[PDB]
Design a protein around this ligand. Structure first.
Ligand SMILES: NCCNS(=O)(=O)c1cccc2cnccc12
Lengths: 19, 353
């Protein structure tokens, strides 16, 4: 499922900006 | 048509009153923009309590003002590290913006000062924690809950864009919940005051509009795309475009095929398809009707915009408050020493701070 893919993505924590 | 006489006159009048408000707000902003405040406190006026998190190019500490006992959130920026990151101008600009703007959902800058080593931005302490925390804790927000927060961002962007400010880092991590359950937008480290087009690749991958990723220039409509991402994430619990690595996220964004959870209402899906719209001649917030295409959308039909602005709507979630200086609504972070060198660093570069 999309939610399971989200969990597996490694990007469930705080996300840094880029510059 | 969709409105009878009374409803049409009321909406027309409301939209004209927004114009009047924004004209006055611009006058007030420009006065402070042109003559910024400076050096309004010093470090030994504060007790350092606990690290609350990070912000762009620095770390944010809960502090207590010794003379009053009032608590604040102080962002500490190491001048040498800022220089190395090539972020001198963005740190100066963040402070300049924060001291010049004034809106109920924008975090206020209470003091600022600098010393030999660091810059200090002493902001209001917003004690309810990040929207990010609450969202990850409960999974997803109901559509009414998401809508309450979204309405505050719509009004805040309407305000900022009238000042020619583009925000460029909307995400739940940057939105703090205050004691009344309303939102406070933080971190203007990527904002820019510009009247037309700009080109910088900056922001957070999941929230970038396609035209930021691509070499073409872009305008304030990137913030309305980002609102679409935020509303989607609030209501779904995850963002519309994600992947293991930013490069793959960018591919999905510019491909642009959004899919929705089956629990999303039809009104929500319609709004999101019009915000997460690659075509700038079609994206809401970028058309002849401006912000009114968003504010008048069916998904916001129950939103009393003035009552949100006046903070008279009951919030869906009131954070728990133990006592003054309680950080129970925050993650724990590494505690980094504040060191102040005997020698002034980067003085000329940060003169304006
Ligand atoms: N992760 C981005 C938010 N960082 S933060 O440390 O929570 C944070 C950043 C900026 C202002 C704040 C005001 N009150 C509380 C916390 C504040």
């Amino acid at each position: 499922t999309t939610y399971a893919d989200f969990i597996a993505s490694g990007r469930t924590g705080r996300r840094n900006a880029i510059h | 048509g969709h409105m009878g006489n009374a409803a049409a006159a009321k909406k027309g009048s409301e939209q004209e009153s927004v114009k009047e408000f924004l004209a006055k707000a611009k006058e007030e902003f420009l006065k402070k923009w042109e003559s910024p405040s400076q050096n309004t406190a010093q470090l030994d006026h504060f007790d350092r309590i606990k690290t609350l998190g990070t912000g762009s190019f620095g770390r944010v500490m809960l502090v207590k003002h010794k003379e009053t006992g009032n608590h604040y959130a102080m962002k500490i920026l190491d001048k040498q590290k800022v220089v190395k990151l090539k972020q001198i101008e963005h740190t100066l600009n963040e402070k300049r913006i924060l001291q010049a703007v004034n809106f109920p959902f924008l975090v206020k800058l209470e003091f600022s000062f600098k010393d030999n080593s660091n810059l200090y931005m002493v902001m209001e302490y917003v004690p309810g924690g990040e929207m990010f925390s609450h969202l990850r804790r409960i999974g997803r927000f109901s559509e009414p809950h998401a809508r309450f927060y979204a309405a505050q961002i719509v009004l805040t962007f309407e305000y900022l864009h009238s000042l020619d400010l583009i925000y460029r880092d909307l995400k739940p991590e940057n939105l703090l919940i205050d004691q009344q359950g309303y939102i406070q937008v933080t971190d203007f480290g990527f904002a820019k005051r510009v009247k037309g087009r700009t080109w910088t690749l900056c922001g957070t991958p999941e929230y970038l509009a396609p035209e930021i990723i691509l070499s073409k220039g872009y305008n304030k409509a990137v913030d309305w795309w980002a609102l679409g991402v935020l509303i989607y994430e609030m209501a779904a619990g995850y963002p519309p475009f994600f992947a293991d690595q930013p490069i793959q996220i960018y591919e999905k964004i510019v491909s642009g095929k959004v899919r929705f959870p089956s629990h999303f209402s039809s009104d929500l899906k319609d709004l999101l398809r019009n915000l997460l719209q690659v075509d700038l001649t079609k994206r809401f917030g970028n058309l002849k009707n401006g912000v009114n295409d968003i504010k008048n959308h069916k998904w916001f039909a129950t939103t009393d915009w003035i009552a949100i602005y006046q903070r008279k709507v009951e919030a869906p979630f009131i954070p728990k408050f133990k006592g003054p200086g309680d950080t129970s609504n925050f993650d724990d972070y590494e505690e980094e020493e504040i060191r102040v060198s005997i020698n002034e660093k980067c003085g000329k570069e940060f003169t304006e701070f």
